[PDB]
């Protein structure tokens, strides 16, 4: 955790690991100070093929500061205006009425608060 | 190599900050007349790049081919 791969304290995502002893390296043990989160550095000790090896994939999600690109199968519907409806806009869920707006958005913004 | 990206007077203002392996770049432009000194005024900077490169950055050098000013956040 300190010298090879540090996860941030505010992490939002998932960790997946599995065992590949049927398929079947180097790590770092000496360094000046701990790593900052999500940093890499390329004093190396090799693994011995102490227990069976594991493979790890870590998924980190970027939470909609840009236009949305990666998301699952849901079918879009026609929008209903001036009527009390339940709405789901890009995973943002609410209950209300929807009207045309005179506010102007700069291109990097997607919603207003 | 790990990361590659190719995309297709004056006063150019930039803000560079590095955190959680992300390099944030902010850019703004303002037209002025004098070159010798920084003029006083207010100008806001919009986001341009968030680069996912996880290295420590402790030094930098400007690349040249007529003045530049550096301040610290």
């Amino acid at each position: 955790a300190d010298y090879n791969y540090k996860l941030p304290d505010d992490f939002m995502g998932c960790v997946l690991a599995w065992n590949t002893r049927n398929i079947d390296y180097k790590y770092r043990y000496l360094r000046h100070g701990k790593l900052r989160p999500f940093e890499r550095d390329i004093p190396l000790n090799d693994y011995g093929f102490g227990y069976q090896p594991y493979r790890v994939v870590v998924l980190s999600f970027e939470l909609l500061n840009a236009p949305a690109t990666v998301c699952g199968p849901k079918l879009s519907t026609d929008l209903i205006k001036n009527q009390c409806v339940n709405f789901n806009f890009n995973g943002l869920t609410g209950t209300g009425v929807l009207t045309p707006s005179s506010k102007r958005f700069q291109p990097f913004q997607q919603f207003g608060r | 190599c790990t990361f590659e990206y190719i995309s297709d007077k004056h006063l150019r203002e930039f803000v560079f900050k590095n955190k959680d392996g992300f390099l944030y770049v902010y850019k703004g432009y303002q037209p002025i007349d004098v070159v010798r000194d920084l003029p006083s005024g207010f100008n806001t900077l919009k986001p341009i790049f968030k680069l996912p490169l996880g290295i420590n950055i402790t030094n930098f050098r400007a690349i040249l081919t007529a003045a530049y000013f550096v301040g610290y956040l």
Partner: peptide
């Protein structure tokens, strides 16, 4: 040489629309 940076270097903190308000934020600013 050395100069002063008066009221200079402000950027947008987040990608959220706001209007007609006063907003206090804590961040790395010049």
């Amino acid at each position: 040489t050395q100069h002063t940076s008066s009221m200079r270097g402000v950027y947008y903190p987040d990608e959220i629309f706001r209007s007609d308000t006063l907003y206090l934020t804590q961040d790395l600013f010049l």
